[PDB]
């Protein structure tokens, strides 16, 4: 039996989001890619450095906003710009969100030497696609 | 037969962006652009407006404090063209010799206490300090009232 | 007004500080997205469009003839013989190299000038005259 | 999920109001904007390459969706 | 009611140097997603028409790169997972442009290049014979 | 907890008029914000007896590279502001044949737009120079000598000499080299050497 | 297998286009290939193959000690290491170990 | 802080090889031809053999940058087949999908 990135049926009480409810064979049929850059296009360079950056950014944001992220990040690259789109929860105070946005945007711009923006979308609770 | 080639048109690097910016007007339904465009994060009062920006500025200062405290972590330059503004800043004097030329650095760094102490040491050693260098020290001392300029943290 | 200002004279701390206050009166928060892009462009953070892949990189303002014609540097070497032939192959490769600066290509040639100078005794045993 | 009749009625009002914004965005007449123009506009504004068309962004009348 | 009375327009200065002449610009764009290339084409064609540029669009054939990997961490060689990367193309061919026009159009469309889409702009430049070649010196 | 939890304001799409200036809402490329886009757009493969997911917290809509900042109204307004930067193509050069007569040489260069921190691309340095040998003042001997010197760079069918240069780090250096090669080829072709009598 | 005219025209073209002019065998032509490209060790793919794991590890360790990064993994191994001290499975002193 | 001591040894080899690349290129050119005298080429043979062993480029190994796996690595991403699949199957690699045809 295949295992890769499959949430397995339980007793019908496990809430899954739309992203985690779709197995890998749907990545270009029902769900899209969580990162969009040019590295993996034909004749394009630096796929390796883009990949390492994505892995770091996903871990940095998970620990920088502990318990706030409601779903996976969407990493966007346009030219020199890096745009991080995060769906967060409405539990942490707004003051603390603004502090962390100013802190993460500055710290990441100096680390990867590019203009970095963080776009937060707040949800009251995790969006449940189905109960498995 | 002769063909007339048009004269070239030259503009600044930001001119095209400024032309596109003129076409749009302020969106009345939105709060100022500096704020996060989200119902939960949008400021809902005049006080929140000030505090939300102050929190964002505090975050930026904390990041800058870390960047300058640990330059090593932000010294890998992968940008082309190189971006000077996104590199760490070094505020400490790198010339440790006691000389007039080494003193000029501390005045450029605006180290009021270091410069005065070094100027005194230089004078005690008996080496010559140029009038221009002494005048530069007075400018630094007179402007700041013989007090250290504010810094991020000690 | 004054016919010629003291442009060569550097500004004093007071002049620098006063110029920073004149910036503050006009300082406002970014008003829209276009303004953010304009600020980054002026700061040098954002790329300048249309995209030029050599933006900010010039190979020390070297000319094409400096890269391609490197025989000027071979003058210290023998005009004829095996060393000349070998070096002609070295410079031919270097002339076809777009990844090296002119300074780096000269370093390669300079290293050979020293190596053969150290091995002159061996070269004389092989009936090769260097310098 | 059960969709009561009042909920459907609120969804219809939203479609009609949204339909007028979509015509305003695309610079067309709100009064002759058809469902085939809506689909063309949504395809341009929200380009999705997902092979399955049922996974692509849709803006249909609530009567055809629910 | 709160409308700016006057607007500062960006300064464009006509220089005293002759402008470059472009016989053709071939703006090839690569993307994993076809719908995104369709939207970009509609943008770039509409922009060209409003600026007076002559634009012809054609779709070069797509390229699919496939490679195979082992499915299990250890042994079970017969079982493989196969991955692919699809690169779709759209070639926007401008014609009879000038250096200034090309600069404006290219900046406008390149700034609006969507994430995950690359570009290769081949610029054919009309030139005149060098002065040295006009006649032989020997 | 002194007060109740902070309550999110209603979305500002409820304040938007149906005749607003939309380009003012999305002036530049930005991520899809469900609170700012006044469209009941749904996305997501529907569950059995279900409907595509709503836009709030919808990660699929966030993954799309939207064109909300490039509506037909915005594009026409944008281009009206950019007409001042354009110069007029010479009316004389109506056809390609007219271009070739007045401008025989064609220089091809390529620019590569990729996403990342570095703009550098080693393919951008290549310069291609094309010139038809009929546009050059070549006699019979010179034309024959040139075709022999260049080799496969010359195409008999089109009568075009293609000189590709990629030796130097920069495109400007490769352009100067291509022009230089054409110059020495022209003059060397005209020069007649004594050993040419052994043909 | 070339005429005198063909040979001398080929040598002129080689001089014009910057190619090897003297007669050179295939073995010695390697010198031209060696200096026309970067050595494999000098290519950015080679010497910058790995990410600087020191920078990442040290940065994220400092940010944890500063209170700005929560390392769930490091928290997990700090609780385990704490429960092993109460259980008596503590790391011994270096040099003064069980053996001697 | 590298994944293991093996990765750390490869990191040092890549560094030393980079430092000696020019010197090794120059000496090899002396050896890789029939023009120069064999006496000179013999001295060059000894000189390149006396350089530190870890400067030899053939000793570098393309290990997975995340897990240090020495085999099964895809050179374009520098990732092992197990780590690459983990990122691809979660939709975190731009444009990479499962192939069916
Ligand atoms: Mg199976
Ligand atoms: Mg090996």
UniProtKB/Swiss-Prot annotation, chain B:
* Location(s), subcellular: Mitochondrion
Q: Where are the PPR repeats?
A: 95-129, 130-154
Q: Which residues form the signal peptide?
A: none
Expression sites (tissue/organ): Abundant in testes, skeletal muscle and heart tissue.
Entry-annotated residues carrying N6-acetyllysine:
72
Disorder this protein is connected to according to its UniProt record? Combined oxidative phosphorylation deficiency 51: An autosomal recessive, mitochondrial disorder characterized by intrauterine growth retardation, low birth weight, poor overall growth, progressive limb rigidity, delayed psychomotor development, hearing loss, and optic atrophy. Brain imaging shows abnormal bilateral signs at the basal ganglia and brainstem. Patient cells show decreased mitochondrial complex I and IV levels and activities, and generalized mitochondrial translation defects.
Of which family is this protein a member? Belongs to the mitochondrion-specific ribosomal protein mS39 family.
Function description: Mitochondrial RNA-binding protein that has a role in mitochondrial translation.
SUBUNIT field? Component of the mitochondrial small ribosomal subunit (mt-SSU). Mature mammalian 55S mitochondrial ribosomes consist of a small (28S) and a large (39S) subunit. The 28S small subunit contains a 12S ribosomal RNA (12S mt-rRNA) and 30 different proteins. The 39S large subunit contains a 16S rRNA (16S mt-rRNA), a copy of mitochondrial valine transfer RNA (mt-tRNA(Val)), which plays an integral structural role, and 52 different proteins. Associated with the 12S mitochondrial rRNA (12S mt-rRNA).
- Covered part of the full sequence, start to end and full length, is 55 to 208 of 689
Curated annotation (Swiss-Prot), chain D:
* Localization per record: Mitochondrion
Q: How is the subunit organization of this protein annotated in UniProt? A: Component of the mitochondrial small ribosomal subunit (mt-SSU). Mature mammalian 55S mitochondrial ribosomes consist of a small (28S) and a large (39S) subunit. The 28S small subunit contains a 12S ribosomal RNA (12S mt-rRNA) and 30 different proteins. The 39S large subunit contains a 16S rRNA (16S mt-rRNA), a copy of mitochondrial valine transfer RNA (mt-tRNA(Val)), which plays an integral structural role, and 52 different proteins.
The text of the family note is: Belongs to the universal ribosomal protein uS9 family.
Q: What is this protein called?
A: Small ribosomal subunit protein uS9m
Which organism is the protein's source? Homo sapiens (Human)
Shown residues within the full chain: 67 to 132 of 396
From Swiss-Prot, chain G:
Name the GO terms of the biological process aspect.
mitochondrial translation; translation
Renumbered residue ranges of the record's region Disordered = 80-100
Q: Where is the composition biased (Basic residues)?
A: 82-92
- Where in the sequence does UniProt note compositional bias of the Basic and acidic residues kind? 93-100
Which key words tag this protein in UniProt?
Acetylation, Mitochondrion, Ribonucleoprotein, Ribosomal protein
GO MF entries: structural constituent of ribosome
Q: Which InterPro entries match?
A: Ribosomal_mS33
Gene Ontology CC annotations of this record: mitochondrial inner membrane; mitochondrial small ribosomal subunit; mitochondrion
Q: Where in the cell is it found?
A: Mitochondrion
Its family? Belongs to the mitochondrion-specific ribosomal protein mS33 family.
Q: What does the subunit comment say? A: Component of the mitochondrial small ribosomal subunit (mt-SSU). Mature mammalian 55S mitochondrial ribosomes consist of a small (28S) and a large (39S) subunit. The 28S small subunit contains a 12S ribosomal RNA (12S mt-rRNA) and 30 different proteins. The 39S large subunit contains a 16S rRNA (16S mt-rRNA), a copy of mitochondrial valine transfer RNA (mt-tRNA(Val)), which plays an integral structural role, and 52 different proteins.
In its UniProt entry, what is this protein called? Small ribosomal subunit protein mS33
Identify the species of origin.
Homo sapiens (Human)
From Swiss-Prot, chain H:
Q: Which GO terms describe its molecular function?
A: RNA binding; structural constituent of ribosome
One GO cellular component, as annotated: mitochondrial ribosome
What top-level branch of life does the organism fall under? Eukaryota
Q: Does the keyword Lipid biosynthesis apply?
A: no
Give a GO biological-process term.
Answer: translation
Cellular localisation:
Mitochondrion
Q: What clinical condition is it connected to? A: Combined oxidative phosphorylation deficiency 38: An autosomal recessive disorder due to mitochondrial dysfunction and characterized by perinatal hypertrophic cardiomyopathy, growth retardation, muscle hypotonia, elevated lactate, dysmorphy and intellectual disability.
**What protein does this entry describe?**
Small ribosomal subunit protein uS14m
- Organism of derivation: Homo sapiens (Human)
**Which part of the complete protein is shown?**
28 to 128 of 128
């Amino acid at each position: 039996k295949n295992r890769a990135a499959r949430v397995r049926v339980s007793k019908g009480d496990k809430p899954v989001t739309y992203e985690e409810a779709h197995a890998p064979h749907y990545i270009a049929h029902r769900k899209g890619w969580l990162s969009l850059h040019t590295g993996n296009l034909d004749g394009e360079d630096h796929a390796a450095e883009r990949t390492v950056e994505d892995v770091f950014l996903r871990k940095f944001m998970w620990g920088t906003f502990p318990g706030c992220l409601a779903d996976q990040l969407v990493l966007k690259r346009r030219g020199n710009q890096l745009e991080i789109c995060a769906v967060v929860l409405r539990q942490l105070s707004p003051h603390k969100y603004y502090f962390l946005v100013g802190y993460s945007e500055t710290l990441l711009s100096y680390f990867y030497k590019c203009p970095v923006r963080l776009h937060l979308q707040t949800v009251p609770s995790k969006v449940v696609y189905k109960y498995l | 037969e002769e063909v007339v080639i048009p004269k070239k048109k030259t503009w600044d690097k930001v001119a095209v962006l400024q032309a596109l910016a003129s076409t749009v007007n302020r969106d009345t339904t939105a709060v100022p652009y500096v704020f996060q465009d989200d119902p939960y994060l949008m400021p809902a009062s005049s006080l929140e407006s000030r505090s939300f920006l102050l929190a964002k500025k505090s975050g930026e200062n904390v990041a800058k404090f870390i960047i300058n405290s640990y330059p090593k972590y932000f010294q890998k330059d992968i940008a082309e063209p190189h971006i000077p503004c996104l590199m760490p800043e070094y505020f400490e004097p790198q010339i440790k010799d006691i000389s007039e030329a080494a003193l000029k650095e501390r005045i450029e760094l605006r180290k009021v206490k270091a410069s005065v102490d070094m100027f005194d040491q230089l004078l005690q050693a008996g080496t010559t300090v140029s009038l221009e260098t002494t005048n530069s020290l007075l400018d630094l001392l007179c402007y700041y009232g013989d007090q250290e300029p504010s810094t991020d943290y000690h | 007004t004054k016919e010629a200002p003291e442009t060569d004279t550097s500004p004093s701390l007071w002049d620098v500080e006063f110029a920073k206050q004149l910036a503050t009166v006009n300082e406002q928060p970014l008003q829209n997205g276009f303004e953010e892009l304009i600020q980054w462009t002026k700061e040098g953070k954002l790329w300048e469009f249309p995209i030029n892949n050599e933006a900010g990189f010039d190979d020390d303002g070297s000319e094409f003839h400096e890269h391609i014609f490197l025989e000027k540097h071979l003058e210290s070497f023998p005009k004829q013989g095996p060393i000349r032939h070998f070096m002609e192959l070295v410079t031919c490769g270097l002339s076809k190299n777009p990844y090296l600066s002119v300074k780096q290509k000269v370093e390669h040639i300079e290293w050979f000038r020293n190596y053969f100078n150290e091995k002159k005794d061996i070269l004389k045993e092989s009936n090769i005259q260097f310098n | 999920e059960t969709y009561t009749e009042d909920f459907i009625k609120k969804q219809i009002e939203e479609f009609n109001i949204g339909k007028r914004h979509l015509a305003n965005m695309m610079g067309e007449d709100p009064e002759t904007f058809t469902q085939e123009d809506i689909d063309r506009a949504i395809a341009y504004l929200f380009p999705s390459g997902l092979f399955e068309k049922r996974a692509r962004p849709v803006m249909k009348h609530p009567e055809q969706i629910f | 009611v709160d409308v700016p009375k006057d607007l500062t327009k960006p300064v464009v200065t006509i220089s005293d140097e002759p402008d470059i002449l472009y016989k053709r610009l071939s703006v090839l764009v690569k993307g994993h997603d076809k719908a995104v290339l369709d939207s970009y084409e509609y943008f770039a064609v509409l922009a060209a028409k409003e600026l007076g540029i002559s634009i012809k669009v054609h779709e070069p054939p797509r390229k699919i790169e496939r490679f195979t990997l082992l499915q299990s961490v250890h042994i079970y060689k017969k079982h493989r997972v196969q991955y692919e990367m699809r690169t779709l193309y759209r070639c926007l061919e401008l014609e009879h442009l000038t250096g200034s026009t090309a600069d404006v159009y290219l900046e406008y469309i390149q700034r609006n290049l969507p994430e995950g889409v690359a570009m290769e702009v081949t610029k054919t430049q009309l030139e005149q014979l060098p002065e040295h070649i006009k006649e032989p010196i020997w | 907890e002194r007060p109740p939890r902070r309550k999110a304001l209603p979305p500002r799409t409820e304040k938007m008029a149906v005749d607003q200036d939309w380009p003012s809402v999305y002036p530049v490329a930005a991520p899809f914000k469900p609170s700012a886009v006044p469209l009941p757009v749904r996305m997501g493969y529907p569950v059995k007896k279900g409907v595509p997911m709503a836009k709030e917290g919808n990660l699929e809509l966030l993954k799309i590279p939207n064109f909300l900042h490039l509506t037909p109204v915005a594009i026409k307004k944008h281009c009206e502001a950019l007409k001042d930067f354009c110069t007029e193509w010479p009316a004389a050069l109506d056809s390609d044949e007219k271009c070739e007569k007045h401008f025989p040489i064609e220089i091809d260069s390529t620019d590569y737009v990729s996403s990342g921190p570095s703009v550098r691309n080693p393919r951008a340095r290549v310069v291609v120079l094309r010139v038809k040998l009929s546009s050059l003042n070549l006699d019979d001997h010179a034309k024959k000598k040139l075709i022999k010197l260049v080799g496969e760079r010359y195409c008999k069918t089109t009568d075009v000499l293609t000189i590709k240069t990629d030796r130097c780090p920069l495109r400007r250096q490769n352009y100067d080299y291509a022009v230089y090669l054409l110059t020495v080829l022209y003059h060397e072709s005209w020069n007649t050497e004594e050993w040419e009598k052994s043909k | 297998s070339l005429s005198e005219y063909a040979f001398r025209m080929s040598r002129l073209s080689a001089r014009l286009f910057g190619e090897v002019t003297r007669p050179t065998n295939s073995k010695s032509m390697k010198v031209v290939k060696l200096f026309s490209e970067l050595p494999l060790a000098k290519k950015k793919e080679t010497y910058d193959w790995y990410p600087n794991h020191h920078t990442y590890a040290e940065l994220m360790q400092t940010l944890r000690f500063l209170g700005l990064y929560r390392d769930e993994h490091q928290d997990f191994m700090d609780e385990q290491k704490r429960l092993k001290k109460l259980r008596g499975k503590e790391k011994p002193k270096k040099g003064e170990g069980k053996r001697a | 802080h590298y994944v293991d001591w093996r990765m750390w040894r490869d990191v040092k080899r890549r560094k030393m090889a980079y430092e000696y690349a020019d010197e090794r290129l120059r000496i090899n050119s002396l050896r890789k031809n029939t023009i120069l005298p064999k006496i000179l080429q013999d001295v060059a043979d000894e000189e390149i053999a006396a350089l530190p062993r870890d400067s030899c480029p053939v000793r570098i190994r393309n290990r997975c940058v995340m897990t240090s796996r020495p085999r099964g690595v895809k050179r374009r991403w520098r990732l092992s087949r197990i780590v690459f699949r983990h990122l691809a199957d979660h939709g975190q690699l731009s444009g990479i999908q499962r192939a069916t045809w």
